[PDB]
């Protein structure tokens, strides 16, 4: 089963003991600087990535603002403040402003999908797509079609307190997602 990789996690994130959950903590942990660790953006990867095939997992999502999740190409930049965009190799859904978004660029796409509790992620490296479904009726949320050219990892980001993500088998607005 998928677990979060603590060696990639931004030091302000708090991972659960079972390595399935992530939230943002108030203080930075004193962790080893590793080239794979996100040092500024509030991100963490799963410990397993995928080069081929089709893969499912489910993500339990908090009801409040501050999370984004999906997949990232392995070469996603880890160091410095980076954009949270498809150009940087992140393909994700996000909750901010009480609104669900597919994080397209240059403008994000608002989703009129109703309340989300758990989302199934379907990664298809044979055809090149990642799709998101709400589990209670499998209604489609969004699909990114991407010609992935490298290994792809489940990706999780929490940049505000008061929300979380968990694995299962104007100015103020900008600051609120700056470190996503």
From Swiss-Prot:
Effect recorded for residue 94 to A: Complete loss of substrate binding
Effect on the protein upon substituting residue 159 to A: Complete loss of interaction with GYG1
PTM section of the record: Auto-ubiquitinates via 'Lys-63'-linked polyubiquitination.
Top-level lineage group: Eukaryota
Organism: Homo sapiens (Human)
Subunit structure: Forms homodimers. Interacts with GNIP2. Interacts with GYG1. Interacts with RNF187 (via C-terminus).
Documented effect of changing residue 43 to A: Complete loss of substrate binding
Subcellular location: Nucleus; Cytoplasm; Golgi apparatus
Family listed: Belongs to the TRIM/RBCC family.
Effect noted on mutating residue 157 to A: Complete loss of interaction with GYG1
Tissue expression remark: Skeletal muscle and placenta, at lower levels in heart, brain and pancreas. Isoform 1 is widely expressed with high level in testis, kidney and heart.
Function statement: E3 ubiquitin-protein ligase that have both tumor-promoting and tumor-suppressing activities and functions in several biological processes including innate immunity, regulation of ferroptosis as well as cell proliferation and migration. Acts as an antiviral effector against multiple viruses by targeting specific viral proteins for ubiquitination and degradation including norovirus NTPase protein or SARS-CoV-2 NSP5 and NSP8 proteins.
Domain B30.2/SPRY span(s) in chain numbering: 1-169
Name this polypeptide is given: E3 ubiquitin-protein ligase TRIM7
Disulphide bridges, residue numbers: none
Description of its domains: The B30.2 domain mediates interaction with GYG1.
